Design a protein around this ligand. Structure first.
Ligand SMILES: [Zn+2]
Ligand SMILES: [Zn+2]
Length: 116
């Protein structure tokens, strides 16, 4: 299973608290329990735009996680809606990468963002 330090890192991602709670709600009949956890994280944090694990994720006001580059490309195309639910984020949507999420994902999947 996951470790205390992993739990501490997850607790820091305060803007995905509800989601992480569901992830944590998820013992397997095959392989190891930590593998089940990893499977569930990967599924939960898929970017809808590029179909990869989100990298430099933006956690939108409407509580969806999209890569910054994917959201940036959409805005440059003059599409200011959430790719996941089409809530109107608006022009000049002030974004910051969700660093706590990025830190968790980089710890669980080191190097997944190589060249991203
Ligand atoms: Zn993406
Ligand atoms: Zn949304």
């Amino acid at each position: 299973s996951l470790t205390a330090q992993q739990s501490s890192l997850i607790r820091e991602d305060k803007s995905n608290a509800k989601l992480w709670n569901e992830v944590l709600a998820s013992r397997p009949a095959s392989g190891s329990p930590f593998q089940l956890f990893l499977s569930k994280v990967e599924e939960t944090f898929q970017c809808i735009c590029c179909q990869e694990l989100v990298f430099r994720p933006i956690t939108t006001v409407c509580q969806h996680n999209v890569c910054k580059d994917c959201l940036d490309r959409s805005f440059r195309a003059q599409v200011f809606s959430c790719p996941a639910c089409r809530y109107d984020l608006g022009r000049s949507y002030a974004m910051q990468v969700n660093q706590p999420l990025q830190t968790v994902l980089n710890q669980l999947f080191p190097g997944y963002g190589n060249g991203r």
